[PDB]
Amino acid sequence: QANLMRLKSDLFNRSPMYPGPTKDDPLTVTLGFFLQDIVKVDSSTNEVDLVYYERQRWKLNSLMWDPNEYGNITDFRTSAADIWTPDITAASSTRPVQVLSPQIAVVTHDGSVMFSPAQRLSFMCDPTGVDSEEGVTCAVKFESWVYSGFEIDLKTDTDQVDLSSYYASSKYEILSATQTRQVQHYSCCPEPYIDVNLVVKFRERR
Amino acid sequence: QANLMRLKSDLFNRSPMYPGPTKDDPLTVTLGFFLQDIVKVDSSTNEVDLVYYERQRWKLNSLMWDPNEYGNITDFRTSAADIWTPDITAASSTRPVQVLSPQIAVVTHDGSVMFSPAQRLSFMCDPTGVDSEEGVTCAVKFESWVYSGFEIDLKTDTDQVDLSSYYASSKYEILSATQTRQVQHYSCCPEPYIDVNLVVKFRERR
Amino acid sequence: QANLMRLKSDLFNRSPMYPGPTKDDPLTVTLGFFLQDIVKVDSSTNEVDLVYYERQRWKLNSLMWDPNEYGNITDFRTSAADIWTPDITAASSTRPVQVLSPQIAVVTHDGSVMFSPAQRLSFMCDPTGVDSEEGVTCAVKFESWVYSGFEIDLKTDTDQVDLSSYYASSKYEILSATQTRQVQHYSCCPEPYIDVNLVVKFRERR
Amino acid sequence: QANLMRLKSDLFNRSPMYPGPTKDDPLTVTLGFFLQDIVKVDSSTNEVDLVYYERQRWKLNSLMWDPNEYGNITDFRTSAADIWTPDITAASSTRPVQVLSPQIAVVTHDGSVMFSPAQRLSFMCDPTGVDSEEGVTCAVKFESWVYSGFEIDLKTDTDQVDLSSYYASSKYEILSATQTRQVQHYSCCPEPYIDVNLVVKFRERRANLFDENLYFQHHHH
Amino acid sequence: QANLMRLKSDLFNRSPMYPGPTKDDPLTVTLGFFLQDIVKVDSSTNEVDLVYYERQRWKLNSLMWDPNEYGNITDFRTSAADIWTPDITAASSTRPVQVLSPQIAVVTHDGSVMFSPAQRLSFMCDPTGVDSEEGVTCAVKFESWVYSGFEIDLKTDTDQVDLSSYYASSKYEILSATQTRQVQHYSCCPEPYIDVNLVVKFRER
Ligand SMILES: CN1[C@@H]2CC[C@H]1C[C@@H](OC(=O)c1c[nH]c3ccccc13)C2
Ligand SMILES: *[C@@H]1O[C@H](CO)[C@@H](O)[C@H](O)[C@H]1NC(C)=O
């Protein structure tokens, strides 16, 4: 307890919180998705509901410590309210995201942070064709709402969405699921914006 | 980090929050809308549901700094709770607005602030005629709930609503969308009342 | 800004909050309703849903100032959390009231406060007869939940509910709308208890 | 104002909050219910929805004062967050209770507190038979979630639920409504557990003087 | 009151909060479920809704006291916000869990804590076959979201779910209900992850 209390106190009570990235000190956040269930489809509104979790990973110099100074502690868990977290947003949501997991992150001695929120999301998707065998494809972009690619860069570790927690008796079967970094220009703005595009092809289960 | 922490501390911890505008020190807030989706229509209640975001822009002397004094930082992101924000309200909503984006603003060295909330709104609209080819027109006014035009003046940069993120497979197709400043004067009251009128003509997609 | 910051600091940071009215220092609160829409009727549950706003007005000696001492400021806006507000409650609601407007009040140099919350309310109402031409009458009382008439007296400025923001294409048409002070006496207790009874006669629009 | 500010400051800012009752310093809470409306019935889920308020009353030595020391103040209103309140819970709810009234209590100079929250509750009830003339009976127990009868004793002032605010045009008509203290014993445990059982018999119903004075027998103290 | 106020002040205001378990100071949390009602089934979405409460139990050295020093107090009740609590999560929920009970725990002089939240849960379950006599089986895992088995170990006191508060007039009848500790290993990662699997077989009454 004592060593950990002391570490948390040195990292959090001895200087102000990390104020977020800038042009001069940009930050890279890695995302990966873990699909759990397509819960429903609404063909009268073109909304589809997904349950998933999302691994977010980034690294801050101000969260580093030497384990020899703190009883060989190499990592700890802490409330997400204690640290900065990136403002990753689904760009085509139609309802506020519902949080299904505790807001807690893992911080490691090299300054890396891992945060894995689970979420239910409603997003814009025309499910016409879902009852066929070819199925239907939908997409949703995830991006920083307020930071450009000059401040936050996104990436993936893999292009394949992990389906190993996908609910075997879902009403919908996943044909494919990818997650792809894109660098986007908009007409408003010279700065690039980075997103991760989640593309899911699915159909009604046999 | 250090320069930014120092700037945030100088702007926010060294004086009280901006107490809002008055008759003598009025403020101009610029709005623009970015329609993303008409999600549904309810002809039994005369409610229509819209997903959009809204750019809000204003400028405060108390948020100015010289970038040479702060390592050449020209802008930063910060939680909307750290600053004053205007109380722009949809006058004909029928439900609390659902927030779809992080509550974060961009503050620039000239004291200008940009806040871009994304929202789902239910508002009063008779959708009779939507299945026709002429479609239907609905309107919603946006105004300060408690500040008159002597304290907050609202403006638009353009009269055309941005439709470049409108969902291509929405059930509803946008025929036109405008956003127009209106100034009202009433016999009861010396104060002008300002609103921005969002007028949208739409119909069922072919 | 500076004069206003100073006024707010003198009124709010230099003494404890007004602890509410007593027998010895009673208060009068004036209410008026502004009906905007009867959104729906549910004849299987006898609930009706109304959207409206409510003007509340009262006066405190502790909110007085001399404008000459504060740069001629005669009024300001402030968050309702900064001040005491009366606990006016709809006695026959069936759901928590949904707030549609920012919780901000206007305070004037004579100590008077104006607070105008907009609300969606579900309340107990048998809509049988609404499809007829005579329509149907429903009523809802608004009262202080915990203060007697010795501490808070309610009144209206007029007995006519204002209908000038009523939605012209509502499914329901207002035939009449009144707001009337009533005094309730309990045999146990000398104190009167006050309510304002909102009585609305309405029917389906032609 | 000044005397009241001073009283609130002496009662709340000068010592820690009452930490709740114990075996050695137990407390009695008195409940009564005031049924307002059976709003609906769901026969596909066996849930029924009620709107009511609930008078709760208890007394603490730490909330006592002498009115002569405080300008003859005998009572005041205050936010429920300023005081300890009992954790009375509906044992068979199926949704979080929705609060319909401001969270404010009346505290009196003898240390007694009166708190009257209004609530919408969904609870477990098979409504089969509601469309008949015999109607249907549902029950829900209200109890302390964590305190035994050694720490909190519950009681009622009357066994009859007050129906004077019951909505006359509800879809459902009340045949009877009682509220009854019960003592529950479990074989594991010496401590009694107290509840108040709200029993309502009702059925589907079959189917002007808005006057400036109204007379009653202050329910929502 | 006085002795209790003093105890609470010594345990909570005189040192920082317990920062949670580590590899070096792990913790065991014991769970048991008390099913109250299967409220509904949705066969178009494969979601089922359960109402239950959950007994959680663990023990901290930092919550110990000697009753002789505090007027013979052996236990007290306190708001769950005053203490660390484990981040036990239903892994296959489809909506945020709705809390039905006050967030209050019992702390005992040996440092043990008992916390019993009541909850409504929507979770992933195919109810096909529920109208038959064999009924249908569904399952939901409960686990620490962020702590591995090196930091938090879960266990049960019994493998039988307690059904003594089950609603006699539910639309659904419980055929069986078990709760079982499981250890999960992933090939990427050396640390085990622990869950308690709640398995419920039920049918229309
Ligand atoms: C994540 N999204 C990216 C960046 C913010 C959010 C919404 C989109 O931005 C804009 O519309 C504008 C940005 N800057 C502007 C300037 C003038 C007009 C529009 C914008 C794209
Ligand atoms: C106050 O009013 C006087 C008289 O009109 C005026 O001269 C003065 O400028 C006002 N004060 C301020 C700070 O505006």
Residue numbers in the entry:
A (entry chain D), B (entry chain E), C (entry chain A): 20 to 225
D (entry chain B): 20 to 226, 233 to 242, 246 to 249
E (entry chain C): 20 to 224
What are the paper's exact sentences on this?
Protein-engineering methods have been exploited to produce a surrogate system for the extracellular neurotransmitter-binding site of a heteromeric human ligand-gated ion channel, the glycine receptor. Acetylcholine-binding protein is a highly conserved ortholog of the pLGIC extracellular ligand-binding domain (ECD) with properties similar to nAChR. Mutations affecting key residues in the orthosteric agonist site at the α1(−)/β(+) interface affect the potency of both activation by glycine and inhibition by strychnine. We therefore set out to generate a high-fidelity surrogate of this α1(−)/β(+) orthosteric binding site using the 2α1:3β stoich­iometry [Fig. 1(a)] by exploiting protein-engineering methods and the thermal stability of acetylcholine-binding protein from Aplysia californica (AcAChBP). Ultimately, the highly stable AcAChBP framework has allowed us to introduce nine amino-acid substitutions that have resulted in a stable surrogate for a heteromeric neurotransmitter site that binds glycine.
Variant II therefore reverted back to Trp164, but with the inclusion of a G162E substitution. Crystal structures of variant II with HEPES, tropisetron and strychnine revealed that the G162E substitution was accommodated with the structure essentially unperturbed compared with variant I, although now incorporating two charged residues (Arg74 and Glu162) to polarize the binding site such that the principal side is negatively charged and the complementary side is positive. The complex structure with HEPES showed this crystallization buffer component binding in two orientations in the orthosteric site in a similar fashion to that reported for LsAChBP. The variant II complex showed tropisetron [Fig. 3(a)] to be present in two of the ten orthosteric sites in the asymmetric unit, with the other sites being occupied by the cryoprotectant ethane-1,2-diol and the N-terminal histidine tails of symmetry-related molecules. The second pose is influenced by the Y110A and G162E substitutions, which allow a solvent-bridged interaction between the glutamate and tropisetron N1. van der Waals interactions between the tropane and aromatic residues are maintained in both poses with minor adjustments of side chains.
